[PDB]
Amino acid sequence: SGAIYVGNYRVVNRHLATHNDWANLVWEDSSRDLLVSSTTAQGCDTIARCDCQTGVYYCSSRRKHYPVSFSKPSLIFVEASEYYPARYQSHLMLAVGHSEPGDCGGILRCQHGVVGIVSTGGNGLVGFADVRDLLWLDE
Ligand SMILES: NC(=O)[C@H]1CCCN(C(=O)Cc2ccccc2CO)C1
Ligand SMILES: [Zn+2]
Numbered sequence: 001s002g003a004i005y006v007g008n009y010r011v012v013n014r015h016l017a018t019h020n021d022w023a024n025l026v027w028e029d030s031s032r033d034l035l036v037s038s039t040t041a042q043g044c045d046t047i048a049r050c051d052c053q054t055g056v057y058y059c060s061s062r063r064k065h066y067p068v069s070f071s072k073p074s075l076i077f078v079e080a081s082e083y084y085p086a087r088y089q090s091h092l093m094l095a096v097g098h099s100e101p102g103d104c105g106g107i108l109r110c111q112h113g114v115v116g117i118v119s120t121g122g123n124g125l126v127g128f129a130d131v132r133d134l135l136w137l138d139e
Contacts, residue, residue: 002105
């Protein structure tokens with residue numbers, strides 16, 4: 001679990017969005033596993049606007065942060081789950097690191113701010129849904 005709070009927006013994994021997220025929907029994209037909802041309070045986070053390929057992510061299943069080298073956002077095949085059929089997920093970045101079911105929503109950060117959130121994993125890999133291209137989050 002986990003979310004990004006920037007301005008009057010809450011960014012979460014689309015497959016973990018609540019009834020309240022859907023009732024306050026701003027934008028969602030199944031192909032990216034992202035959903036953004038509106039909030040009444042101002043948020044705590046800053047979004048990175050960079051091309052970093054190293055950062056640190058929070059892994060809830062270890063209660064720890066880990067440094068990672070991650071690939072550029074791209075279209076990657078993701079096996080079927082209870083949430084989605086087998087499909088290509090876009091704007092996804094992979095890295096070697098621990099993740100298991102439950103870790104989605106953990107933030108990935110570089111020195112410039114929030115880069116994205118955990119969205120996939122398995123067999124010593126962790127995938128992150130990029131948010132750096134969503135320029136409207138800051139206005
Ligand atoms: N974006 C998606 O389609 C995801 C929807 C939820 C399931 N999913 C995973 O990758 C789960 C997973 C399995 C094994 C280790 C780690 C994880 C990530 O927590 C795919
Ligand atoms: Zn950066």
